[PDB]
Amino acid sequence: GFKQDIATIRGDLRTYAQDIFLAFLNKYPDERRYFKNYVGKSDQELKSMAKFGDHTEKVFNLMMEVADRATDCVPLASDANTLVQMKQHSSLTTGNFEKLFVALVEYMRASGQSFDSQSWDRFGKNLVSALSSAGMK
Amino acid sequence: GFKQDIATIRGDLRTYAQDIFLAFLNKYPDERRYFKNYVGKSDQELKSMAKFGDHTEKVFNLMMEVADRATDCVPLASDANTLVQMKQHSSLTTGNFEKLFVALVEYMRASGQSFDSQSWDRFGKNLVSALSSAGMK
Numbered sequence A, B: 001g002f003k004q005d006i007a008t009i010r011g012d013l014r015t016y017a018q019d020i021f022l023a024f025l026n027k028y029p030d031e032r033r034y035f036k037n038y039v040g041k042s043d044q045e046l047k048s049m050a051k052f053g054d055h056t057e058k059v060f061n062l063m064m065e066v067a068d069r070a071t072d073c074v075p076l077a078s079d080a081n082t083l084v085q086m087k088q089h090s091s092l093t094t095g096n097f098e099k100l101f102v103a104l105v106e107y108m109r110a111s112g113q114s115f116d117s118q119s120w121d122r123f124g125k126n127l128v129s130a131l132s133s134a135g136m137k
């Protein structure tokens, strides 16, 4: 289930973080514009960049902590607030987060490996609700 | 489901309230001691007391609002904090709440009226967790 998924992802954080982030950018290519260092770079080019692996790991590590801090896929309001008041997120809307999760759920459903995909969708929905309540437009 | 069950209970609140609370006191009689003048009385004697219906109803009014304020059966932290800080709950530990929800779930399952008894199970456990987090022993 959802708790095992956190362990699956944590077990191979760098690989899952990179694969899921790329799946997001592939499904929603216009989202790349937010990451200026990644424009015009193939996947193998992106992996040769220290910041790409290091960013994507720090992103998914945080997501996993928020996921682990949740009860029945409802995140802490404090965690949503962290994400809203992060300076790297100043220009974002809840729509950006919706997109990331749609891509994450799609990736899970297409992977061999078992994931509790319904639960990640639900977590995504609850997190979007929380981001809105914490002031993200 | 859970959300509809809230409406069901609200639709016949005093009846459901007294009956569920009676189910609680009959399953766990030693519990009448937190209350005044409950001991030594049959169900019908209790239901004719001046206060019994009024106080049981008020408990359930608030229980339903806490259930309504929840997301996926996870109550609000501030709702838990209210229940912990109520002077009239000063003698309580989370176990008292545990016994109340065990009886409540047992009641729903035995009833003719369809309830999502397992969601109430979940909600009870999550409320206990929240009371602990709020500082209840």
Ligand code: HEM
Residues within 6 Å of the ligand: A031, A034, A035, A051, A054, A055, A058, A059, A060, A062, A063, A083, A088, A089, A092, A096, A097, A100
């Ligand atoms: C729950 C989902 C998300 C989590 C947990 C998260 C976490 C983070 C963290 C921790 C950083 C700082 C990492 C660092 O500087 O080393 C970050 C940076 C950033 N994030 Fe978010 N993020 C999330 C969603 C998003 C979304 C939806 C977008 C936009 C589509 C976004 C855009 C950025 C950008 C552009 C940066 C700066 C790039 C960089 O770190 O070099 N993130 N993310």
Ligand code: HEM
Residues within 6 Å of the ligand: B031, B034, B035, B036, B054, B055, B058, B059, B060, B062, B063, B066, B088, B089, B092, B096, B097, B100
């Ligand atoms: C989530 C479940 C509960 C809710 C929403 C709740 C809510 C309330 C409310 C709103 C009152 C004020 C009633 C009034 O003054 O008329 C109250 C009083 C009280 N509650 Fe709680 N309660 C809950 C669980 C419990 C449990 C499990 C116990 C003990 C086993 C308990 C013991 C008391 C006592 C002793 C009083 C005052 C004496 C009395 O009203 O007869 N309650 N409750």
Ligand SMILES: Oc1c(Br)cc(Br)cc1Br
Residues within 6 Å of the ligand: A020, A021, A024, A059, A060, A063, A100, A101, A103, A104
């Ligand atoms: O910050 C994130 C981005 Br941008 C995309 C995906 Br998918 C997950 C996270 Br966390």
